[PDB]
Design a protein around this nucleic acid. Sequence first.
RNA 1: GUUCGCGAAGCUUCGUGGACAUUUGGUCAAUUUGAAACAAUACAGAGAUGAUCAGCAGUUCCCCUGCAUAAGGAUGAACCGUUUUACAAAGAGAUUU
RNA 2: GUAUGUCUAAAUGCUCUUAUUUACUAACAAAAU
Lengths: 195, 114, 209, 97, 252, 321, 49, 86
Amino acid sequence: YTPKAEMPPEHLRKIINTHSDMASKMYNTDKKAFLGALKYLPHAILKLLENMPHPWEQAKEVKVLYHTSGAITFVNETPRVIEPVYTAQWSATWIAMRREKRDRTHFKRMRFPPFDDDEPPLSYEQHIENIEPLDPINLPLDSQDDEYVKDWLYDSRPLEEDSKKVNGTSYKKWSFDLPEMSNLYRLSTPLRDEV
Amino acid sequence: SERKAINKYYPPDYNPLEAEKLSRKMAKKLKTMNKSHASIRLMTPFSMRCLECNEYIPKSRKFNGKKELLKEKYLDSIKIYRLTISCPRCANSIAFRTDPGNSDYVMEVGGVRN
Amino acid sequence: NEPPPNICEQCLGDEANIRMTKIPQGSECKICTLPFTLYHFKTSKRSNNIIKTLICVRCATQRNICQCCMLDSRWHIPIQLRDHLISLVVMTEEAKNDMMKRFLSLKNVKLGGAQITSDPSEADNIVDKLKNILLSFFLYNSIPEWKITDTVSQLLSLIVNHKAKCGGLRFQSSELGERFVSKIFIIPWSTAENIKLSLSLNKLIQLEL
Amino acid sequence: MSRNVDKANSVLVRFQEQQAESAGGYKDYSRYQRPRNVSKVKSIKEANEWKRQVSKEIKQKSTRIYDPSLNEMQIAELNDELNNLFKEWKRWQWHID
Amino acid sequence: SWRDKSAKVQVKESELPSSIPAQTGLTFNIWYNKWSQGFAGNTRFVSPFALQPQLHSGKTRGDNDGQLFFCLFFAKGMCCLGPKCEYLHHIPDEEDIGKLALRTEVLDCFGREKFADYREDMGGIGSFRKKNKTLYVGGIDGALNSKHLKPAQIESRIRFVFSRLGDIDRIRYVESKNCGFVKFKYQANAEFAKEAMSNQTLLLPSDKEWDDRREGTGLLVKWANEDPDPAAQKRLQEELKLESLNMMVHLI
Amino acid sequence: LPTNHNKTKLLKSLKNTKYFQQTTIDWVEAGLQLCRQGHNMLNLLIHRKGLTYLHLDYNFNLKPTKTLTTKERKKSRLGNSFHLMRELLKMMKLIVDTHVQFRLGNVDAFQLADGIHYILNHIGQLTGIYRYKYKVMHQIRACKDLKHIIYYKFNKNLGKGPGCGFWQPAWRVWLNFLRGTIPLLERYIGNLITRQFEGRSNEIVKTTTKQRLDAYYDLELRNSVMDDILEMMPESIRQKKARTILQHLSEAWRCWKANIPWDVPGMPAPIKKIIERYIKSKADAWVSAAHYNRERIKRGAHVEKTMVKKNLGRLTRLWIK
Amino acid sequence: VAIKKPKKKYGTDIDYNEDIVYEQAPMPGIYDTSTEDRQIKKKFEQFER
Amino acid sequence: PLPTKAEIQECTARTKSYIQRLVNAKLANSNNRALLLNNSHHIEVVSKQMDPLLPRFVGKKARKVVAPTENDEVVPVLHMDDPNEW
RNA sequence: GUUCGCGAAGCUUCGUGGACAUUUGGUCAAUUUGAAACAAUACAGAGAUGAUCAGCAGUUCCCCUGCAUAAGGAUGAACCGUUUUACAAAGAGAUUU
RNA sequence: GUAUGUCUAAAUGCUCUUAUUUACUAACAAAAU
Ligand SMILES: [Mg+2]
Ligand SMILES: [Zn+2]
Ligand SMILES: [Zn+2]
């Protein structure tokens, strides 16, 4: 029937924050709900992991379902891509990585875990406000060779909404012109290396 | 949660030396740790008779004893211990000492060896 | 398979349409502590507070009572009272034990009296039988204070011990008292002899402990 | 630290106890030995707790001393112990407040 | 007259209604909200608040809508919702009682399920099997901070607190048992009183120990196990008989 | 080949209720929520279980506060479900944590990528899943293989060092692993929570187990013998006699084992005969079993030390006989 | 008198009556039985006293 | 007589329907995924969708329950009719 | 508020008839009194058998850990006690009618 | 595999000693050239 109400994220955030110091007879049932939710926590994990923003992406917005109790939150969308485009993107990223390696005398590899065992993971509200997330991995393009792909190649939804090159916002089917395809192929030389 | 647990959780502020000091301060006050006759499980090597009710507790029979330190050591730097037991039937405190000169024990106003 | 809910006329409401939800093994019955389907209805759509069923159908059947009201299905009287009446013309002993209560619930005997209430024959007969059977100021000289207070009000803090029988009313106003005197069981200010004696005795009793 | 006592008096546990005492005021008057000389206890609550503990001890003593082997000397000894406990209890009922 | 006396109530504001638990134990159990790994502490602590009803009692959001059940929090004396509370804020009057007398078997005046068996300590929300209007009062020593008072005085105090809270049937202080039996007209009223006076001090401002009333332990208000001595029993029987008669009359 | 029937995925069902509502969220935010929510769940469950002394880090590494007494330990041994869940949560945190770091000015995009890659390859070292479910070992191996391949492709002209991104295949592998778990965890974790709410009535043990088989068999035999004896002749107060019969049977068995002739004078022909027959049956079952065991031993076929000892003893006895 | 502390919801076999089996309503039913029972119980009150 | 074919079929249907129903009920009960009147007055029963996190059957808690036999009718246990050897 | 019509003042404003949209949520209400457990102190303290020890079951209106129809729980818990009648036949001696 | 069970009314800081342990647990396993 009638679709779900697109709620504000703010509400969700508030809900989450409420169930941090949860120890009253108020939300007795919320604790029960939380307990129940273990059932689907692995599913949730799988979802979230699946939606991992790719290195050509500063920050992915993602669809989310969440129990109004605040017990569990599923990333809802399943991330589909235009396969060749995706491959091209990956190739580009690979190239960038290689370049970085070439450049850097020492490459500062992360320490693990990234936050301390004592320190409770900062809420998202500490770094919404923070400066523009630093630039992601997308190689230096050129207008002559990669003329067609450059505008969209590194976008969250690899090809834009409301275009004639994909089905639409559902992003279920794609049809490409030749030159763009050619460009993609050229890009993907590292990965698609097939006989 | 598992007997071979590598690391016990500590609070985020746990100055270990300080903690130790605190414990020490609250060790004189403490009931257990500040007492004698600390428990032990032991089998009986002597195989002896409980002097009150004549219950013939045989060799190797297991008991939850009390080991206590005897202040008067043997020679100099090798300690000797009183090892309290109860007879099964009557609750008479049997005990024995471990004088290591003979590599054996001594009865201590509990029962008699036979 | 499930039997139907036994909710009384006054319990349920005054309207020709009520919507309710059933919650199979919702709660444990209060008597028996054994899972059963909760029916809960709102009476009128907008009238606040729900009416959940507090007992299992079986238990209700046994006691012959409304699953909400806990009153006789027929006469709408508390179980004690209804049973008491029957006795007057034997009462139920709910066994208040973890295990035994459940067992009792599962038995299907109609505990005690319930049978009489159920049958038109028996209930009616009982009723008939019953019918036949039927056919400042101190205060001195047992009855409750809520009655005394009412009386005082009519006449227009009110302490009364019963072992003493010595009620020291304190209106704290000269107006209220002087109205109270004119508008009118010994009542002084702050067989008479017999009464005095009795009062004295009462006082003594009060004072020995 | 087998047999539980050791675990109880392991340093970590002690530290935890201390922390509790500091913040909120959880003491275990079972855990510490009751003091010998009263009037080194300005707080009332503490005193009350001590009294309670001694009462408990007395009760425990009572429970055991009516055992069937009445002629054994342990019982006799306890009789004196019981008396001592009673005395202690009485003392604890001092008249400062 | 609570309706025309006031509308407002606001007993204890939502800034400071309560801290959540009181530290027994070492660690705090998130699921039960009760301290664990230890149990040392008599636990019962005196209410920071109280029902001064003449001041507090008022119209509510419930009154307008036609709520049956009275506000537990109001009774306790800490209903931060106040005028926007959905439960009623006044001492249960007779009319109200009459109105909810159908439901009063299964659940209290607070709209919460009466049980089949009494709690072993007679401690809370009485059984639907045994109707009752009769409260055990106890811990009166502790509620008055171990004050050397006259029994009579104590009794008077009890009366003062309880009369205000509901229409009294009869009250008895006892020196030997060290208690205060109260009986009410209506069960609902009794329940309300119990709710109010649970963990309450019996002390007054004029007393010298007013500022340290918090440090004590409050009134232990519970349900009355029926009095065994014979006159009382006889009276009870008579009452029962009367009730039966009334019922019969209603029936015919 | 997948489900013909099932359209109804999990999320859809949830959506169909009123209790879920849906927003659009930044992925990092979502991750954070998951971490927090997940953490809460694990604490809440733990607290319910009663064990308040196993403290969860916010990194999901669970470990005990004090050293637990034995009773406490017994109470508080969580199993293969809960631990698995914890591990999963930890993994999530690690990937989510890296992204959080990236978002914050703390770490470059390249660095973030590399970190992610490290996590996915090093799941094995980074956090114990494998401990609790040791088929994650396969996944780990696969990841390692990928790393080997990917690194060799990626560092051809370029030299050895850290900074290889290209986490994709590893990520994919982990996702696929998670698929399998979803089901297992839903049975496991779900079951656990059910137990916590409503904890089992009358479980039935199963004699297909190596342990308990023999005893069970013996019991059955005894029962059969008793039944036969009952069938045989009339008795008054037979319960008492049953015990005696059982004892007799036992004695007979012992005799057989020893190779003593079990001749008792009072034993009436029929009952005695029946007992003899059942002991013969037992012997047949026993001797054959022993032989089988011996054969197994000869092969090298997962014999129990105790079982082997028994065989040695039994076989010796047989030889003697 | 102090009761035996319960372990996991058991019955105190004084009250409640334990798992009762019926008298089994028969054909030659007579009401003197109840009276007899009452009489018997009367004596035990006296004993208690 | 060996029972009538039609009758047999009917019996099968009855039991088949019943057993199937029972199985369905059981399935419903399992926690893994994959109108009325009182007295004269008419009343609509509903089933509200509870939240999928909270325990489905919040009533049940694995309770022990002793049942009475409740055998009111008396079973007739009918029958017919060297001790030193046996 | 949207608006599609009627009637008055100067397409702008008032006054009206309609259409559109139409009964949420609660088995729950925030601290002692409707029921969590460990822990702690004290006191004892470990299946047969003489002793020491393994494992398996069994009965139950006892459960716990365990995903568990694995496995593990003090040999997981309590079982070790009480125990006089479908009551007969024969012989000998004694008091009462 | 670190057993177990009953039992429960609702002085302050100070420092100095160490190349150790009155340490405890035994459920686990047991052979020679
Ligand atoms: Mg064992
Ligand atoms: Zn009703
Ligand atoms: Zn309120």
